[PDB]
Design a protein around this nucleic acid. Sequence first.
RNA 1: GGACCUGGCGGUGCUUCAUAUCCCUCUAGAGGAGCCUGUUCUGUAAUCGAUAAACCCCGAUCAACCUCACCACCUCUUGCUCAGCCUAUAUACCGCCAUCUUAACCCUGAUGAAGGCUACAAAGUACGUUAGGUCAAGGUGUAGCCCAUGAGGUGGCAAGAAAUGGGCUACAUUUUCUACCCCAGAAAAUUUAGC
Lengths: 164, 402, 126
Amino acid sequence: CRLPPLPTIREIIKLLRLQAAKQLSQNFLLDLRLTDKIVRKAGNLTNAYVYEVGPGPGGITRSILNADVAELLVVEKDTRFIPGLQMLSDAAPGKLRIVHGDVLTFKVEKAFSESLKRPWEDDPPNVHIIGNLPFSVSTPLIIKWLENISCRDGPFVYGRTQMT
Amino acid sequence: AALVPGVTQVDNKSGFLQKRPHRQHPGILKLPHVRLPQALANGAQLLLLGSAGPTMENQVQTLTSYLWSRHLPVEPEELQRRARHLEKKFLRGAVLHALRKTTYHWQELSYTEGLSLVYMAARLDGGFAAVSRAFHEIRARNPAFQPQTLMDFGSGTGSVTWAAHSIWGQSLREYMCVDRSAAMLVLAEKLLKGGSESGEPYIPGVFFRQFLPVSPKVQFDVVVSAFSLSELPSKADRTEVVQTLWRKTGHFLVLVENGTKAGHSLLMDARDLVLKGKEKSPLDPRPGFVFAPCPHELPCPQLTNLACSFSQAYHPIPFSWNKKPKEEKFSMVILARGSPEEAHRWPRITQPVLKRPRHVHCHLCCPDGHMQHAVLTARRHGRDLYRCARVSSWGDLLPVLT
Amino acid sequence: RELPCAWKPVTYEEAHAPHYIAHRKGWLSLHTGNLDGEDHAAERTVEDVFLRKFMWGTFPGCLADQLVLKRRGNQLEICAVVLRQLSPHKYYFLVGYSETLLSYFYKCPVRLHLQTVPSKVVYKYL
RNA sequence: GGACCUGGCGGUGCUUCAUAUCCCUCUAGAGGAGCCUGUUCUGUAAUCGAUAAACCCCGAUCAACCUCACCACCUCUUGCUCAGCCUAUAUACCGCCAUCUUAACCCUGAUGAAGGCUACAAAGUACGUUAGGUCAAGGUGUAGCCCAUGAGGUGGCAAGAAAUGGGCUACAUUUUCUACCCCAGAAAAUUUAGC
Ligand SMILES: C[S@@+](CC[C@H](N)C(=O)[O-])C[C@H]1O[C@@H](n2cnc3c(N)ncnc32)[C@H](O)[C@@H]1O
Ligand code: SF4
Ligand SMILES: [Mg+2]
Ligand SMILES: [Mg+2]
């Protein structure tokens, strides 16, 4: 697929309207080889439904898209990255669904189809979560999802969904 | 020789002659006087409000003439043959002094903030017209082409980006612009935002980079280089850039230079380089052919002593020194992937057409690889073809068959 | 070998700029044509142009300095300054030839007043 | 790996001031009418194309009921004179215009990279280039067409609309007309430069 180029740090700074390299207050992985490695460790994503959290520039998003996924749901809090993700979606028709919101409050149990729900006692239900979030947000998120696994609800209504 | 009196006849496909007048014959590629977009013209003047006085008129003129008269850098090999010849005549220090004369001193231009404004005031309007004429070639003869991607090596002021928008604005979605100078990139973005540091870009999807990407995997629909290969320090640099640009070309590679001997020779090096493929197993195996202006892939018949250039008249950006319309003399070559569409290629008029009583002078580059000075008249060639040549102009095609 | 590797005395007259023509420098040609009322200034100019060209073409490498073209009525005095490199017999032969040819070209009694110098008289260095 | 030397910082901010160019300040106009042009669109078979070559003879001027150019039709050609064309070429030369290129010595640091100032003074001194323009006050060649790029005739052609660029006129009461050359009589918002 012909995907648009990964934004550079200068483009990121201008997009965030910071005009400087010191007021960024954020770290990005703008190397597609490392993102490829991460998505490789995430497992076989052929015709899989992936829930991506905290994309930002979209290196992980591009690496997932290069893998032959069926539908990639992408939840982003910052509006300023949504134009770039929309260009990415235009590049790949129908494989990318952008949503604005907090991952701490977004409801995933309704996002995907009900035909992907498999029993708990079976293998993982072809739905994966991948995330490179700020470290101030991943700990609350993993606590919340551990509670959800305890209740077998939220992202785990589909079954034993794997997380990376 | 594509004109044989009494034998060569007009080529009537689509039922042309019956269905349309002669002034609109398919070889007509003339473009009316080019006017820049108002957003560009307004932006350029706004950026110059700080300093556009009498000094700027002199500076713009000095830069314009200096760039026009530039010669290609003298490769070392040319230098020793000159050195030995002067050595034999004298029969080392004396030869060098006699070599500083009779040889061109080629220098880099470091496009800083100051010299970037002078360039924009001197070449924005002129460069825009030349590229618009080149793109008109692709649109007029292939109107179904709807590119979605464009790269511009040597993006100084963004003239290529603006020109591409004016023709393929409804389908282009990515404009990759490359330029090593930080100031030129800074100036080019201001021009997209209405000439202000803060604003909304007038064209969407423009990407600015300082280094040329080198990868065959990423391939662009239209790759453009306008008045940029003449700034490279050597023939090796020109060789390497043109190879990369061709490797990343999807449909068309548009190269545009000054209409001088230095410019024309530069493009014929690049024309031969792409035609004579050297890569053993390229990622894209498709061949290349000259979409325009040449009707053949054989060596240029005018490269020996003459040049080959074309003209496009345009309206200069209103300034304290721009009153009358100007003409932009430029050299171009367009290289297209694949093979020629058909075998019915038509000669190219490469020189002003001289209209005289009952006869017309046309200088044609013919498909067989030879120039032909044809004096067309109604008695010898026929009523139709004479009228077609009567209305034709510099840079058009002549529809002749057999 | 490579482009990065590849990349004066004056006489009194050569030393001085044009704006000293009436301050420090003089005039080489002298005639009444340009005066107010006098006529044929253009003809005298053309005469001087041809005459300088012909003197420089007839005495190659001998003229140390520019000529001085003076005019008294018909008379045309070419007061030239030459060198002492060429043999005196050739000076005499050339003087006779040039005087006769110029007299028959301008239809006036042309004359030559060579002044030989051992070498060019330098004033300064520029 | 330890210590040191020259640095460059293609540097970044603040403080103070010199702070002229540009600001504020002063004078003057520059919107509107009427016509002529540059460019665009539309239209024609065609050129609202030109007068060392016509009307126009107040200023100017348009089409002239002129000739050349254009469109559609036709005629002649050994014609003029071993004819004739102004047809190209300075993208053939020349000429003319224009572009661009063309130090030494002496000290200090143990004789290391290296450094060298104090005035009531402490080592510092001495020609080419051009697919360039010009065939109007200039030339030397070179090519083309000669049953037509020559010579004629019969008709037609003489545009329409805008938005913007430029230009020409009249525009007044501190004016206008007469006598005089100044004591009379009658009339009625942006910009742009400039000191
Ligand atoms: C003469 S400008 C071209 C103008 C532009 N094409 C236009 O139409 O306005 C050439 C630009 O190429 C850039 N350039 C020169 N050498 C380069 C190189 N080696 N790699 C990338 N850019 C280069 C210069 O900085 C300059 O801005
Ligand atoms: S059009 Fe003909 S003369 Fe011009 S560059 Fe191509 S081959 Fe050469
Ligand atoms: Mg010329
Ligand atoms: Mg007419």
